[PDB]
Amino acid sequence: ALYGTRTHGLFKRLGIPGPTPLPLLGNVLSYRQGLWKFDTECYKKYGKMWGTYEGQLPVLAITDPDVIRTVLVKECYSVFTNRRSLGPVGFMKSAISLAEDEEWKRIRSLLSPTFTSGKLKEMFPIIAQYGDVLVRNLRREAEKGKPVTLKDIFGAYSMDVITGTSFGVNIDSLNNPQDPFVESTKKFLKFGFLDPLFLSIILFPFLTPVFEALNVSLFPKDTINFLSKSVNRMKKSRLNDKQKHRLDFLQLMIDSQNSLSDLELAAQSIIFIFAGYETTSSVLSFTLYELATHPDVQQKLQKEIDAVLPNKAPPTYDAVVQMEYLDMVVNETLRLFPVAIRLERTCKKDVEINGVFIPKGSMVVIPTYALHHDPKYWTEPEEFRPERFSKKKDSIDPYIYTPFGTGPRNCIGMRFALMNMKLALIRVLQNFSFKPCKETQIPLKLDTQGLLQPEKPIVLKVDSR
C-alpha cells in the first residue's frame, strides 16, 4: 500500500536475485559509488541477471549476448524503442535522443545524412585544420618542459571540431581560454544520480508535470539560453552569408524549415554539443594515458603512423580510417573506458525476457562496463592490449563490446567521433611522445559522479620528436 514500496517484491516474486531495496529510494543510493562499480559488484555477486529498483522503477540487468541481441536489435521497434523517461526537460523533449517512438524515427531519419561516408570525407579537412592548431598549441605547452593537463587542450579540440563541422563557424576554443561553449556543458547534472532535482524525479515521478508547468528542467537554464542564442546567431549568419558553405548539420535542419521548428532545431544542436564534447575529450585523454603507461604500444603505434605517413605527411581521410593498429588502440581504450558506462531501454509494454515476465515501463540495463571488464570474455581484462582487436583474431561479439551501443538506437555519431579522435592522435603522435611524470596518477582512479572520468585530471609529460 505504501507509496514507497509497491513494486519492491517484483523480482523476489520472479525469482530474480538482487540487492534488497530501501523504502522510497530503492537501490538508487548504491549508485553513489559509481555506476561502473555498482554494476560490476552486482554482476560478480548475482550472476547473469539481477534486478534493482530506482525508487519504485524495476530495473532488470542482463548479460547474456543472445538476450542482449533480443533487446537491442530484435525487439527494438516493438518493445525497447526508447531509453529512460528523464523527466522535466522542456523543449529538449524534441531532441533526437530524448524523442520517442515515431517522433524519434523521423528526427533520426532527418539527421542521419549528416554522417554519410561522403559527408565525413567532405568535412575531414576542417577537422585537419583544428589538428594543426592542436599540435601547435600542444608544442607551446610542451616546450616549457612542464606537464600538460590533457582535458584543457583536448576538450578545446573536441569542442572545435563539433562546432566547425556542424555549424560552419570557427569559435576557436583552442586559442580562446574562457570558452563559453565549454563551460556551458559543465553545469549539467554535476552530481549525477545524487542531483537533488533528478533524485526527486526518481523518487516522485509524478512531479514531472509539476516541474514542466514551472519551467524547471534537468538542463541548466543558463546553458540552454546561451546555446539557443548562439545557434540562432549562427543560423541568421548562415541565412545572410551570400557566399558558399557546406551542406552541414546546420544547413540540413535549415532546409527542413523552409519546406522542424526553431526550438526543435536548437534541441538537436544542444544535444550534439553535449554528446560530442565530453565523450571525445575523455576518450582522447584515456588513450594518451594508456599510451604513456604502455610505451611499447605508443612506439609501435608511432611506427605505423610513420610507415603510412612518412616524413610527417598530412593524414588523409582514407589513411586515418584504415590504420589497423590505430583502430585497435582506440577500440581497446573504449573497452577499458566505455564513458557511458551502460545502455538502457524501457519496456513500452509487457514482455518476456529470458523466461522472465517484465511489466510495462520497467527498465532493462546492459552493463557495458561490467561486460567490458569480464574475465569470462577477455583475458586479463584490466590489461591494455590492443591485440585483442586484431583482425587475425576471432570477431568481437557486438553485444559484449558496446561502447557505442547496438541496434537502431546506437550512436549516430560513432564514425564521426572515431574520425575526430584518430585524426588528433595521429597528429600529436607524429610530433610528440607521452610519458608519466610525478603528477600523473598511476594507476588511474575513477570518479564516482556522472560520465566515466578520472578522479584527478590526467596530466602527462609531452616531449617533441
Ligand code: HEM
Ligand atoms: C567516443 C565518443 C562517443 C561515445 C562513447 C558515444 C557513446 C554513445 C552511446 C553508448 C550511445 C547510446 C547508444 C545506445 O543506447 O544503444 C550514444 C548515442 C548517441 N550519440 Fe554518441 N558517443 C560518442 C560520440 C558522439 C558524438 C561525437 C555525437 C554527435 C556528433 C554523438 C551523438 C549521439 C546521439 C545523438 C546519440 C543518440 C542516438 C539516438 O538515440 O537515436 N555521440 N552514444
Ligand SMILES: CC[C@]1(C)C[C@@H](OC(=O)CSc2n[nH]c(N)n2)[C@]2(C)[C@H](C)CC[C@]3(CCC(=O)[C@H]32)[C@@H](C)[C@@H]1O
Ligand atoms: C546530453 C545528452 C544525453 C542526455 C547524455 C549523454 O551524456 C552527455 O552528452 C554528456 S553528460 C555531461 N556533459 N557535461 C556534464 N556536466 N554532463 C550520454 C550519457 C552519452 C555520453 C552520449 C549519448 C547519450 C545517449 C545515451 C547516453 O549514454 C547519453 C546522449 C544522446 C543523451 O541524450
Ligand SMILES: CC[C@]1(C)C[C@@H](OC(=O)CSc2n[nH]c(N)n2)[C@]2(C)[C@H](C)CC[C@]3(CCC(=O)[C@H]32)[C@@H](C)[C@@H]1O
Ligand atoms: C545511459 C547513461 C546513464 C546510465 C544515464 C544518463 O541518462 C541518459 O543518458 C538518458 S539518454 C535517454 N533517455 N531517454 C532517451 N530516449 N534517451 C544520465 C541520467 C544523464 C542524462 C547523463 C549522465 C549519466 C551520468 C549521471 C546521470 O545523471 C546519467 C550517464 C553517464 C549514465 O551512465
